[PDB]
Design a protein around this ligand. Structure first.
Ligand SMILES: Cc1cc2nc3c(=O)[nH]c(=O)nc-3n(C[C@H](O)[C@H](O)[C@H](O)COP(=O)(O)OP(=O)(O)OC[C@H]3O[C@@H](n4cnc5c(N)ncnc54)[C@H](O)[C@@H]3O)c2cc1C
Ligand SMILES: Cc1cc2nc3c(=O)[nH]c(=O)nc-3n(C[C@H](O)[C@H](O)[C@H](O)COP(=O)(O)OP(=O)(O)OC[C@H]3O[C@@H](n4cnc5c(N)ncnc54)[C@H](O)[C@@H]3O)c2cc1C
Ligand SMILES: [Ca+2]
Ligand SMILES: [Ca+2]
Ligand SMILES: [Ca+2]
Ligand SMILES: [Ca+2]
Lengths: 350, 350
């Protein structure tokens, strides 16, 4: 089957018109040998490209394009499969430098192209990268049919977050929560999970149902990085009292086109509110930064140093489930209200 | 100051080239009298327009444009204020029909324009309309500086939602939650609130801190509409046992550029998880579909038929706060586990 990809990217360093022209001419030479066609346009440090050809050949080229150091922030806008005919059959690669174009009608089109692209980049920061993953795979996220899938669900939150808001100027609270969300998001993504939303100071994330080992490793890595962050912050920095609790459970999530037609999403976990609230109660109650359910513990395959802590209920059922953690130096902590009082005393004096 | 707006819209019915041409020529005549300039382009049932001129005159015209029946789904991509010079000084309105354009270089630009617009429309369904409101006001949402603002916070959820997932095929669960999210979102928006996110089956929304009357009215209207929905559904429909609980509180939210640089948002309510969980516990415990805190009750100005129900704690503080509802026929209900067992019995038999 024929495939056609459309993407936009950004110059990761200044490029001259001659340098853009050579990319186009060399792209033409290579695509001709691959029986691939398309068009490359540049405008004010933005690349736009459409590539079409045999799916296997398209992916090889796009893999190479992704790796090219000369541009960054590569976003696939559209991925067509089973394409019946080419849009650009005589263009192995046609290059159109819009900066140099001065045609009468193209001038307002350039302004609109630029504006649509900048707008699109704004929106990209405010949507989940999993919708773009669906898009890069050749499927409209609005067309996903409903599916029940078991996931590992990750909930973390900030210990005594209300103390920050009460004791610090608002710009500094934002700075702390951003440092927290950044640490969590980078590690979860590194470990193959995906952040689905922030609920206040709570980070909610999914791992595949068979990836409990990765969810546990992500949790430990987050705790390790927050300890390093606390230790290494400037004197008097609020980050010195940034602590997290983390809870893991398994949940039956539903994938689909979900929402209000006004607002949509790709996933729903029923009673996420209550699982998060119950996990937060356990991390506070147990003086344990990481807690997870029996289902998570027994889905893991690696030889984690598991420790049984208590029974709780997470789902609002009457089923009493075993709560576990990892026993290592990091999780071997003493208290509770002492943590709360410590944070407030410290933040009062900075 | 000069203002420049850029927007895209959709034909709400087929329009010929002659009809598009007349719009352009009449727009030119009117804009010349207003000392307004810009460009109008059409492509495959999409309008693009840039308008520039004196801010007061621009808004008058754009108000009229918004009301024009001949297009729909009008989205302002960019709003510039204090503009130093015009982009289109000699174009009172220049009209560019791209469907009819066959120029060699414009052909791939049209495909890219179309693809960027369709992509942008996808992303629009998966972002909050409050980011577009920020954009239409002339401010980059990534540039908002941190602010603490008191809001009325709305949390609703679906009674016994886990029973739906357990008893119905997944496509039918999605259908029910979508019907629920649609009812909530339309009424909250009608009442001047905004939905900020779905947390599982929980709808989270904000009203301005002085709009408690609107939040209460929205809650009552939702309950009224769900009763009508239950009564009027087809025989054996799952919607017959769709019930909601609703909780209102006041919260100190923080507006700003918040998130992970990967993922961003414009607002954070610390401990939203716990306020939602505690409000849900109260609607279950009180057999009352609507509960709200003393702060909400005393922020209201209208003469609601308030009834005191109980004390609870919502914030995780030690402060015991009065919980109120509205005493009318709709909220005068009997039970608890009876509601849970009813839903399951009904859904088992359809
Ligand atoms: C914007 C841009 C577009 C490119 N498009 C193509 C392309 O269409 N086809 C191609 O072969 N290489 C393209 N490249 C270059 C590509 O990333 C590699 O540099 C090149 O393909 C490496 O060739 P190789 O087989 O010798 O290894 C593009 C590079 C950039 C920056
Ligand atoms: C796509 C589109 C663009 C338009 N642009 C303009 C415009 O730029 N200026 C204008 O005056 N009217 C414009 N209009 C028309 C506008 O919506 C009203 O029909 C018109 O302005 C009403 O004129 P009135 O003063 O007689 O009342 C546009 C309509 C459409 C559908
Ligand atoms: Ca918290
Ligand atoms: Ca047990
Ligand atoms: Ca619920
Ligand atoms: Ca009391």
């Amino acid at each position: 089957g024929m495939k056609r990809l459309t993407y936009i990217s950004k110059f990761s360093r200044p490029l001259s018109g001659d340098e853009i022209e050579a990319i186009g001419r060399i792209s033409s030479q290579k695509n001709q040998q691959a029986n691939v066609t398309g068009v490359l346009l540049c405008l004010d440090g933005i690349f736009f490209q459409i590539l079409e050809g045999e799916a296997e050949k398209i992916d090889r080229i796009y893999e190479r394009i992704l790796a090219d150091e000369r541009h960054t922030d590569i976003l696939c806008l559209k991925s067509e499969v089973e394409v019946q005919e080419r849009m650009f059959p005589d263009w192995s690669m046609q290059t159109i430098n819009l900066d140099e174009n001065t045609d009468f009608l193209i001038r307002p089109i350039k302004v609109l192209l630029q504006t649509l692209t900048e707008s699109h980049r704004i929106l990209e920061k405010y949507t989940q990268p999993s919708i773009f993953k669906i898009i890069s795979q050749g499927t409209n996220p609005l067309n996903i049919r409903p599916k029940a899938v078991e996931k590992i669900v990750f909930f973390s939150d900030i210990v005594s977050f209300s103390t920050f808001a009460e004791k610090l100027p608002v710009e500094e609270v934002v700075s702390v929560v951003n440092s927290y969300f950044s640490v969590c998001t980078a590690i979860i993504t590194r470990q193959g999970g995906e952040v689905t939303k922030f609920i206040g100071d709570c980070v909610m994330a999914y791992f595949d149902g068979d990836c409990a080992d990765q969810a546990i490793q992500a949790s430990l890595d987050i705790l390790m990085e927050l300890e390093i962050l606390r230790n290494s912050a400037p004197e008097g920095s609020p980050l010195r009292v940034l602590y997290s609790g983390i809870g893991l459970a398994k949940g039956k999530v539903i994938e689909g086109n979900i929402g209000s037609e006004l607002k949509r999403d790709y996933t729903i976990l029923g009673d996420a509110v209550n699982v998060a609230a119950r996990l937060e109660a356990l991390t506070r109650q147990l003086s344990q930064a990481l807690v997870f359910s029996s289902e998570v513990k027994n889905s893991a395959t690696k030889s984690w140093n598991f420790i049984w802590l208590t029974d709780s209920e997470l789902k609002g059922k009457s089923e009493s489930i075993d709560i576990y953690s990892i026993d290592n130096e990091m999780t071997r902590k003493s208290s509770g209200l002492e943590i709360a009082r410590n944070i407030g005393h410290y933040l009062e004096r900075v």
